[PDB]
CSV table of N, CA and C and ligand atoms in Angstrom, one decimal:
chain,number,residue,atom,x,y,z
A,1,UNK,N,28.4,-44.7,-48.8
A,1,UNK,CA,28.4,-43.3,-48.7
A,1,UNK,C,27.0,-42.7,-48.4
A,2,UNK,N,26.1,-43.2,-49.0
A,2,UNK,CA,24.7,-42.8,-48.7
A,2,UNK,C,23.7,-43.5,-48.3
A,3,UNK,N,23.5,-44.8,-48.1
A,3,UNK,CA,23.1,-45.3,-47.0
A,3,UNK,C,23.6,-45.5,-45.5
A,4,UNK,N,22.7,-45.2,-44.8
A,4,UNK,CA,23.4,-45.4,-43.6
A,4,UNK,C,22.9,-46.1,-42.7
A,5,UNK,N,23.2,-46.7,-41.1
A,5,UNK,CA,22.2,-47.4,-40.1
A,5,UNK,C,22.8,-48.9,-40.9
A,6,UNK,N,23.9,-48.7,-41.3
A,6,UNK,CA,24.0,-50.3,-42.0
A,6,UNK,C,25.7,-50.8,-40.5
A,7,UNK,N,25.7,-50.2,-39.7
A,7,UNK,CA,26.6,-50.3,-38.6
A,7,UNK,C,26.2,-50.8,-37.3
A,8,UNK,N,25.5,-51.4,-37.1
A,8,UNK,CA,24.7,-51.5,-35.6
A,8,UNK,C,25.6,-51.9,-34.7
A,9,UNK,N,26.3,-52.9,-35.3
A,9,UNK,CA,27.1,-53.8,-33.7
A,9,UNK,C,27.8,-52.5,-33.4
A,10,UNK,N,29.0,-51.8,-33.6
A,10,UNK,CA,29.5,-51.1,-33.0
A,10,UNK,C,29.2,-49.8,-32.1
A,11,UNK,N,28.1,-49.4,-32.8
A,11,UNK,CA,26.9,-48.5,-32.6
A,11,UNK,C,26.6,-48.8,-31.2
A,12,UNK,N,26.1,-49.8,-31.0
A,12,UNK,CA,25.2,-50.8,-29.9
A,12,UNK,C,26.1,-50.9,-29.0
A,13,UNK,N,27.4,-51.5,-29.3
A,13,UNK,CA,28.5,-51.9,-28.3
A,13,UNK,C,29.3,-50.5,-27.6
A,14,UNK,N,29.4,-49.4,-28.5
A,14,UNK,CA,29.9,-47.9,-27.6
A,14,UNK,C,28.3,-47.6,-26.7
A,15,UNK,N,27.1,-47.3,-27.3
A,15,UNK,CA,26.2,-47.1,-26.3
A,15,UNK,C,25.5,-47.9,-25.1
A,16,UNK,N,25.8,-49.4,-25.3
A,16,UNK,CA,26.2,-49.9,-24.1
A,16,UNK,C,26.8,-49.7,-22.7
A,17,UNK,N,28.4,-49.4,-23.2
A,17,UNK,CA,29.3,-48.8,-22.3
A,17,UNK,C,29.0,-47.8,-21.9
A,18,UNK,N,28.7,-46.8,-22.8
A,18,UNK,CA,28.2,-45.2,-22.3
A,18,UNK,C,26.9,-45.1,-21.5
A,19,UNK,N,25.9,-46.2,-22.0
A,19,UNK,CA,24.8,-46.1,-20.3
A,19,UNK,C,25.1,-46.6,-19.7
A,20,UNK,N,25.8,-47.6,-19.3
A,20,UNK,CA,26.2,-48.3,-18.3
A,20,UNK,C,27.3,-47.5,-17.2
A,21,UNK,N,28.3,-46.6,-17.8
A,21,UNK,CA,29.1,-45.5,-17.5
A,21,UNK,C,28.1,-44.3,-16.5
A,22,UNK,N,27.4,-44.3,-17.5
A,22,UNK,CA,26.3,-43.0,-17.3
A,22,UNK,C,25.3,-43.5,-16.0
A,23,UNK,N,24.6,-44.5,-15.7
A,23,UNK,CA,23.7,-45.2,-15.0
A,23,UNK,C,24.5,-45.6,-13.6
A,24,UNK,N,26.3,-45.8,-13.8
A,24,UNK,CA,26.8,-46.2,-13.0
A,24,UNK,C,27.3,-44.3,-11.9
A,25,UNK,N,27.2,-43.9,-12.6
A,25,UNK,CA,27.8,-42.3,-12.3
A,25,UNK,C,26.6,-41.4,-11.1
A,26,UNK,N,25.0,-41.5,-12.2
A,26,UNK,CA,23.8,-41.3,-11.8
A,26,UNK,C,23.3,-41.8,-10.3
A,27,UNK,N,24.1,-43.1,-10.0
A,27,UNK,CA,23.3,-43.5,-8.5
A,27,UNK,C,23.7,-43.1,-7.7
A,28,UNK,N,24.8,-42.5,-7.8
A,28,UNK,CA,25.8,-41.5,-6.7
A,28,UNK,C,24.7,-41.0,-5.7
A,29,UNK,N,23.1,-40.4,-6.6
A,29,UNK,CA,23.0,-39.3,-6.2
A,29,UNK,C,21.5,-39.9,-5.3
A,30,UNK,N,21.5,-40.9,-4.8
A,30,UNK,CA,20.7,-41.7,-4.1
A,30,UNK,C,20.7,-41.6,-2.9
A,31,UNK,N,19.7,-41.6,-2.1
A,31,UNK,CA,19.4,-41.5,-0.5
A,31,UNK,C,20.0,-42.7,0.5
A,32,UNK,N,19.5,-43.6,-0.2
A,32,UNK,CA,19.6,-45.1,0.2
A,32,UNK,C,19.4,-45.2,1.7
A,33,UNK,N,18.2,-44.1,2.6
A,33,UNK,CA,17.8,-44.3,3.6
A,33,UNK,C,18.5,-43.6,4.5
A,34,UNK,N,19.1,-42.7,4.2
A,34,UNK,CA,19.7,-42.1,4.8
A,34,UNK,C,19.2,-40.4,5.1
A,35,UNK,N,19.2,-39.8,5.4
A,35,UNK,CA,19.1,-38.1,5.3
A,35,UNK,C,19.6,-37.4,4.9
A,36,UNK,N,20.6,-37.4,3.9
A,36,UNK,CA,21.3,-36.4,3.0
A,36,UNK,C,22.4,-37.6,2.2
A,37,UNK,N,22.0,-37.2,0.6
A,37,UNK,CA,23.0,-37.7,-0.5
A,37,UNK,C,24.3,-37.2,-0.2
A,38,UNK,N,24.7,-35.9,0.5
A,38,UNK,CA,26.0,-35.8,0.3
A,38,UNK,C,26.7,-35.9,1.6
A,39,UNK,N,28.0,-36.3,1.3
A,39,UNK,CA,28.5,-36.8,2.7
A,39,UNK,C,29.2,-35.7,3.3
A,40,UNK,N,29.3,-34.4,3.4
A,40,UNK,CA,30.3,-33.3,3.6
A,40,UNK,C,29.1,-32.8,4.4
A,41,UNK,N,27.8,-33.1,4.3
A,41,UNK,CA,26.5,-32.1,4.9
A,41,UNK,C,25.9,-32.8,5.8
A,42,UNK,N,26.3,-34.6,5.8
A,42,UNK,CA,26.0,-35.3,7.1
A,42,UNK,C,26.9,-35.3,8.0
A,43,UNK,N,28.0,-35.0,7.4
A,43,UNK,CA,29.5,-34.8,8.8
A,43,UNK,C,29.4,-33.8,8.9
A,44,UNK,N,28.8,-32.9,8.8
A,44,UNK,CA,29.5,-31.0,9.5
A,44,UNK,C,28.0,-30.9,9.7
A,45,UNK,N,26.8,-32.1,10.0
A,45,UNK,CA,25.6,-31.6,10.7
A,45,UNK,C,25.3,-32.2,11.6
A,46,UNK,N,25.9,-33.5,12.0
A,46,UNK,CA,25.7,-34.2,12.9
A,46,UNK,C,26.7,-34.8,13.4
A,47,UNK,N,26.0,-35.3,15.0
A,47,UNK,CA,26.9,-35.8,15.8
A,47,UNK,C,27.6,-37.2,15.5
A,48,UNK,N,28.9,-37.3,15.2
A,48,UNK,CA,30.0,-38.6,14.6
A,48,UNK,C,29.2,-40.5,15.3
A,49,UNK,N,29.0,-40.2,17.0
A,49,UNK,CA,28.1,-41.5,17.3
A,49,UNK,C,27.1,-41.9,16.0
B,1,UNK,N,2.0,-17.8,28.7
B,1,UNK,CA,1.7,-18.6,27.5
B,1,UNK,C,0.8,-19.2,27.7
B,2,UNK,N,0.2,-19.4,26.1
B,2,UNK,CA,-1.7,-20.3,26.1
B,2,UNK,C,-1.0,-21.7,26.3
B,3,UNK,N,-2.2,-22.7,26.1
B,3,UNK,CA,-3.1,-24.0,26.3
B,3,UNK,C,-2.1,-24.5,25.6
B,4,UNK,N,-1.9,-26.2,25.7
B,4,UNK,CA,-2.1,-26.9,24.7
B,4,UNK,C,-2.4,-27.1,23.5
B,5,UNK,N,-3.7,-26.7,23.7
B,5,UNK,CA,-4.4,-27.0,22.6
B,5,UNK,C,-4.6,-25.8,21.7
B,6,UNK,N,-4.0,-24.6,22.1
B,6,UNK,CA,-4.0,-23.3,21.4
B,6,UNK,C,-2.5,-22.8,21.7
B,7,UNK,N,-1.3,-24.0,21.4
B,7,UNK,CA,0.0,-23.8,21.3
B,7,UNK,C,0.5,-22.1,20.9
B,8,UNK,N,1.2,-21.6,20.7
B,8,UNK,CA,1.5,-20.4,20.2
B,8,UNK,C,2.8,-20.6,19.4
B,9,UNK,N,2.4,-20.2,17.9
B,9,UNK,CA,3.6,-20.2,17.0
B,9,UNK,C,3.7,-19.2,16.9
B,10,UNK,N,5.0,-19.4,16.4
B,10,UNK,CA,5.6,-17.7,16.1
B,10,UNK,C,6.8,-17.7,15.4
B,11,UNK,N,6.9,-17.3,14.1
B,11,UNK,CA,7.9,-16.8,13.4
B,11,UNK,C,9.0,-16.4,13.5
B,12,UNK,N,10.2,-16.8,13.6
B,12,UNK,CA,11.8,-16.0,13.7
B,12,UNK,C,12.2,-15.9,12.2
B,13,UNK,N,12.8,-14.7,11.7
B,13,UNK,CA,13.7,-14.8,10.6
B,13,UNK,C,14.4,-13.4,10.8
B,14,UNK,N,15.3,-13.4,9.4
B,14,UNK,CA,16.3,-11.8,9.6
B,14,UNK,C,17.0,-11.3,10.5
B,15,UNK,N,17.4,-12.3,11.5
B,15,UNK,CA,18.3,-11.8,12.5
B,15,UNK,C,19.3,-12.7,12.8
B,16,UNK,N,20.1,-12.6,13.3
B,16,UNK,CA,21.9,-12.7,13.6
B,16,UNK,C,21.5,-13.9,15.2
B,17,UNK,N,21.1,-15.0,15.1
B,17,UNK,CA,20.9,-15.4,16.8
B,17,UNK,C,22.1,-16.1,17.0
B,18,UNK,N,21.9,-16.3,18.7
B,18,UNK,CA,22.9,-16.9,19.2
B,18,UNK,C,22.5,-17.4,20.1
B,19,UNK,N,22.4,-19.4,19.7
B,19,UNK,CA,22.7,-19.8,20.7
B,19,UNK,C,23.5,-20.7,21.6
B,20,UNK,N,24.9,-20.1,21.5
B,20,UNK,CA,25.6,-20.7,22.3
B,20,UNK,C,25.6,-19.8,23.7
B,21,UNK,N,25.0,-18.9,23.9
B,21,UNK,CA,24.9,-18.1,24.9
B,21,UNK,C,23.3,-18.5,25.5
B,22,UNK,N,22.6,-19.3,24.9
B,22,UNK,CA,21.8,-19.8,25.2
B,22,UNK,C,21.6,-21.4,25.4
B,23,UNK,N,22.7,-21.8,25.0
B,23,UNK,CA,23.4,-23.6,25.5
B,23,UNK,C,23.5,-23.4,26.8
B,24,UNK,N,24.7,-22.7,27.1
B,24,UNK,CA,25.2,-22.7,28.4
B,24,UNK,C,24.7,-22.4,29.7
B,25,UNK,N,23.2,-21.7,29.0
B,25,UNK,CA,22.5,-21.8,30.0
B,25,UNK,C,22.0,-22.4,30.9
B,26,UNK,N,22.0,-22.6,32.6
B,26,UNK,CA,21.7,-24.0,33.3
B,26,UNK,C,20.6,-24.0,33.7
B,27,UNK,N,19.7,-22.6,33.8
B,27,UNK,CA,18.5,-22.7,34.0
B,27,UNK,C,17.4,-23.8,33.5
B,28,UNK,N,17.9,-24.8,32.3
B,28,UNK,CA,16.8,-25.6,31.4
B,28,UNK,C,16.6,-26.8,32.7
B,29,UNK,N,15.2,-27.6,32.8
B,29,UNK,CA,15.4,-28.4,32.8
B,29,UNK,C,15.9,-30.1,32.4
B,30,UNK,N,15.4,-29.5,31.0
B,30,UNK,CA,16.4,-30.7,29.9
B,30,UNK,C,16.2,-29.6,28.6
B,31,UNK,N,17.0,-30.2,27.7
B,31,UNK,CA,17.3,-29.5,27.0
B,31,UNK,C,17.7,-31.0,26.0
B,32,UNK,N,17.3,-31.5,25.0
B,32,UNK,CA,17.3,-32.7,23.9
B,32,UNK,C,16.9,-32.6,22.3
B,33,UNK,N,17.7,-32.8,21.1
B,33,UNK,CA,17.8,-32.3,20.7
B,33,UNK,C,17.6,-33.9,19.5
B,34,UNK,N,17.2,-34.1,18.2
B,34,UNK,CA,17.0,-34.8,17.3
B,34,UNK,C,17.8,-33.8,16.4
B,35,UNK,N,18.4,-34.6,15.0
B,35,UNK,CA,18.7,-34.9,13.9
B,35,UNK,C,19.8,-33.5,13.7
B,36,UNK,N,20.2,-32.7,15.2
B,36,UNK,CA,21.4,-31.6,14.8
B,36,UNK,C,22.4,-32.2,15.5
B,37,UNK,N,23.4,-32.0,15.7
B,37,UNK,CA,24.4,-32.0,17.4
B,37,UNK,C,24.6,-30.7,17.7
B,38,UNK,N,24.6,-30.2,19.1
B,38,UNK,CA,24.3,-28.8,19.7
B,38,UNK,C,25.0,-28.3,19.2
B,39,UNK,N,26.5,-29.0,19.2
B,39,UNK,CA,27.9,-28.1,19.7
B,39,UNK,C,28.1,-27.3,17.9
B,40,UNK,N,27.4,-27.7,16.9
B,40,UNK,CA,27.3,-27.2,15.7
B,40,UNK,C,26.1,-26.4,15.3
B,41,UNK,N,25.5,-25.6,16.1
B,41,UNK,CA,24.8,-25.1,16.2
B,41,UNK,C,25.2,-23.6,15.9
B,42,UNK,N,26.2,-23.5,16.1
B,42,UNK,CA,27.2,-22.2,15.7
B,42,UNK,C,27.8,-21.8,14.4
B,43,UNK,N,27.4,-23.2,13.1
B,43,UNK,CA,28.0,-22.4,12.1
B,43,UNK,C,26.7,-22.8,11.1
B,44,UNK,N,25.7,-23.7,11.4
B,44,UNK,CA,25.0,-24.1,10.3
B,44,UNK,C,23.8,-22.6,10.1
B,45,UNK,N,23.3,-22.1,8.8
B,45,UNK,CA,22.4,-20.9,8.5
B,45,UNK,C,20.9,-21.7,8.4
B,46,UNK,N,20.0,-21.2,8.8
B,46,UNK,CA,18.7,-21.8,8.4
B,46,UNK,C,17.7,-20.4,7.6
B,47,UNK,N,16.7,-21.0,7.0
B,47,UNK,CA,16.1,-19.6,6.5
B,47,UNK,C,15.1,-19.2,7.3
B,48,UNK,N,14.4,-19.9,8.0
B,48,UNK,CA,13.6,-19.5,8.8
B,48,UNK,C,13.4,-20.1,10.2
B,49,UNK,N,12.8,-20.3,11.3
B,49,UNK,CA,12.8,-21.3,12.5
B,49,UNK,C,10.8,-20.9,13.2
C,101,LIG,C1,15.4,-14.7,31.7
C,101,LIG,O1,16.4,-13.8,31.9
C,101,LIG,C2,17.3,-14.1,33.0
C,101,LIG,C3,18.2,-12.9,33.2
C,101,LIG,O2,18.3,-12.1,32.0
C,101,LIG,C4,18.1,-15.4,32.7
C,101,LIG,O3,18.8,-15.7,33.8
C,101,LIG,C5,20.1,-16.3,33.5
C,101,LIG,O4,20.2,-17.6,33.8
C,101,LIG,C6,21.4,-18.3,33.5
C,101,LIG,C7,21.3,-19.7,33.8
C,101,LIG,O5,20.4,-19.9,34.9
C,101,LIG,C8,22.6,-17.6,34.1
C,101,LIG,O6,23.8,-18.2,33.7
C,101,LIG,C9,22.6,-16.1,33.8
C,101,LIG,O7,23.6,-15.4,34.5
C,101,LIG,C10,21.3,-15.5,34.1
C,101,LIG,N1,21.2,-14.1,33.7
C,101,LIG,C11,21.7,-13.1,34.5
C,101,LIG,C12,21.6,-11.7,33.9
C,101,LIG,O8,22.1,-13.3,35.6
C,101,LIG,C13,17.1,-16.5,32.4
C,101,LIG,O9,17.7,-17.7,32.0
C,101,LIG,C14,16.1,-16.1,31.3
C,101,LIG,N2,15.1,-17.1,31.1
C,101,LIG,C15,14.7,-17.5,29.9
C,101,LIG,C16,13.6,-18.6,29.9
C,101,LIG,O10,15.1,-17.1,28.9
């Protein structure tokens, strides 16, 4: 009841998942050499060739 | 119009343009265009040119 931090593995094992969720979600928003992250603003700005 | 080397810039904004009445024009001798496609030239807004 009044100690606490005595839980790690499970602790460790949800925050795992949740960066790995989070970090996988985050790269969406990457260039990757391209001119625009979103793809709705490279198709209705340029020519399809 | 000046030099080369005393190009002349100049400012457009605040106004309603149009140039698809200026595509069609045949007077150009070329007329070449990077990173837009012409024929979309009709709905995309810029803030300044
Ligand atoms: C300068 O203005 C004239 C006339 O306002 C333009 O001439 C037009 O040329 C196009 C293509 O050659 C024709 O389709 C139009 O019919 C012409 N206009 C008229 C009223 O006949 C000329 O293109 C303009 N030049 C520049 C550089 O803007």
């Amino acid at each position: 009841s009044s100690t606490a931090s005595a839980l790690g593995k499970l602790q460790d094992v949800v925050n795992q998942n949740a960066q790995a969720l989070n970090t996988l979600v985050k790269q969406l928003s990457s260039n990757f050499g391209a001119i625009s992250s979103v793809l709705n603003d490279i198709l209705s700005r340029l020519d399809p060739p | 119009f000046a030099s080369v080397y005393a190009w002349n810039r100049k400012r457009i904004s605040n106004c309603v343009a149009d140039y698809s009445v200026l595509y069609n024009s045949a007077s150009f001798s070329t007329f070449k265009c990077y990173g837009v496609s012409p024929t979309k030239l009709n709905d995309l807004c810029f803030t300044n040119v």
